[PDB]
Design a protein around this ligand. Sequence first.
Ligand code: VRD
Ligand code: VRD
Ligand code: VRD
Ligand code: VRD
Lengths: 122, 122, 122, 122
Amino acid sequence: SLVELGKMILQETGKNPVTSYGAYGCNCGVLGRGKPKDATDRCCYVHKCCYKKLTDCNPKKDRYSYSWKNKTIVCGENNACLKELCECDKAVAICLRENLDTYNKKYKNNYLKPFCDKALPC
Amino acid sequence: SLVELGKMILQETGKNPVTSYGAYGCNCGVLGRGKPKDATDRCCYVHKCCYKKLTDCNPKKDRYSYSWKNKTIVCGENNACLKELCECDKAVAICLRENLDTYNKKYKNNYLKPFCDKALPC
Amino acid sequence: SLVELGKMILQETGKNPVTSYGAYGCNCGVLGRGKPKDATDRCCYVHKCCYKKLTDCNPKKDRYSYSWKNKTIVCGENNACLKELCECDKAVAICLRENLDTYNKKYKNNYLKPFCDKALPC
Amino acid sequence: SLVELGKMILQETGKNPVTSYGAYGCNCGVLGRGKPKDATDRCCYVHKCCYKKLTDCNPKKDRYSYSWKNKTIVCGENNACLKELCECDKAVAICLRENLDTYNKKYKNNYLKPFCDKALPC
Ligand SMILES: CCc1c(C(=O)C(N)=O)c2c(OCC(=O)O)cccc2n1Cc1ccccc1
Ligand SMILES: CCc1c(C(=O)C(N)=O)c2c(OCC(=O)O)cccc2n1Cc1ccccc1
Ligand SMILES: CCc1c(C(=O)C(N)=O)c2c(OCC(=O)O)cccc2n1Cc1ccccc1
Ligand SMILES: CCc1c(C(=O)C(N)=O)c2c(OCC(=O)O)cccc2n1Cc1ccccc1
């Protein structure tokens, strides 16, 4: 769920998911995909494509278990959908950390929302 | 201060410092040094010796700054006491994480109140 | 920003950046690039080309942190743009020092403005 | 003179000579030699011994010339006493930089006369 996702983002990046990624670019924290504005935005674009493959479980509200071992996210062996859901959130946490260097303050808090292009298919 | 120390332990080990290390063995959390019970206890033994050589500041109360970059603790530059105080806290966070493999709840002071021998000098 | 740049130039060259480089040649301190009149001028040409690559921050007005360690300018860790900015400024301060030998006061005070040719592209 | 000495210290160490070294340990910035408290203090003890040999001039008062060339203090030529005086000052500026790693503001007198033993002779 968003509980697990937010904890992974903070564990990997050290940032509050809401204040830093609540509405960044055309994809991060908002509903629906748009053409990404930068690399951080593209992380959330891929993550939304990860989610849409997952029927038989609810990515937004379904809880799951994971552990933080050797400063690494380790998805607990689980249901197929829950395991894949955990691997979706782990990928976007790593992706957001990796692109902190080009994180741009001008893209937060839905400054880009009126300018967002229609997204290409996943 | 204990504020920064607590966040480093959380970021490195993934554990709550109060529940996991608030009173563990003969050195972790408790006041004063004793002969260590295991590898985790020895981390806190070393950390307490690290604090002992700091005289120009109050290790428990004085605040400093540090960064979480690439899942690594990076101490902020400061005067001798505050910088070395940050380094004391960093080494114990890494040490406790490295020794999670042998962390044993039997050394938590709430499971069994350990009999602690007089510590050797630092 | 110019505050950090001016301190670097003083630290490296020992010269006041305003009085020595406020309007030197066809590139130093003045607006716009021109064909360099000497090696000092070319330092500022390269520096202006360095700035032109930076589009995610404001090279003239954005602050950054650096320190003086072992008589070396050491750029503090930041985002990609601010780190590249600091490295642009460190490089021009260093370049200006290396070419103090051929510094010509005849090129000061924007005397060469009618002599400035179109520069080669960056 | 002290004017040239203070400029050297700022150039080499990056520190304000008054606020960092104006009364530090048993030798730095105070009158007379004492048993050094640490490596920084020892730099000032050695420097005071350097001044002791300069009888043909006035170390604190007499001016001399030096240049900041390639981030090196270069004493200008002069008579024996004044050239030796500049080299005394250059040496203490270098010594203080080299020992910034163990600088500790705990040794600043802060207008309380510390316990100072009689120094070894020189
Ligand atoms: C970038 C972080 C993010 C999402 C992403 O990781 C992302 N934009 O992909 C996301 C999200 O995405 C899933 C989806 O769109 O269904 C939906 C809703 C909020 C979303 N926050 C913000 C957040 C998450 C967890 C705790 C606190 C804040
Ligand atoms: C192992 C964690 C620890 C200490 C150590 O790291 C350790 N035992 O060395 C320590 C401590 O030690 C310093 C000293 O003895 O002055 C004193 C008091 C509490 C101490 N907690 C618990 C804690 C720290 C920070 C936030 C919340 C809880
Ligand atoms: C050569 C020094 C210099 C610039 C350069 O280093 C240079 N010509 O590249 C520069 C400058 O250049 C950046 C740009 O044109 O955007 C713009 C404005 C002033 C500029 N001073 C003068 C100065 C710098 C810092 C403090 C005080 C005076
Ligand atoms: C450590 C710096 C220092 C002295 C030394 O370098 C040192 N303690 O040797 C020293 C000093 O020493 C020479 C002597 O006692 O005759 C005498 C007086 C002040 C002295 N400041 C402080 C200072 C010097 C220059 C400008 C501003 C502040």
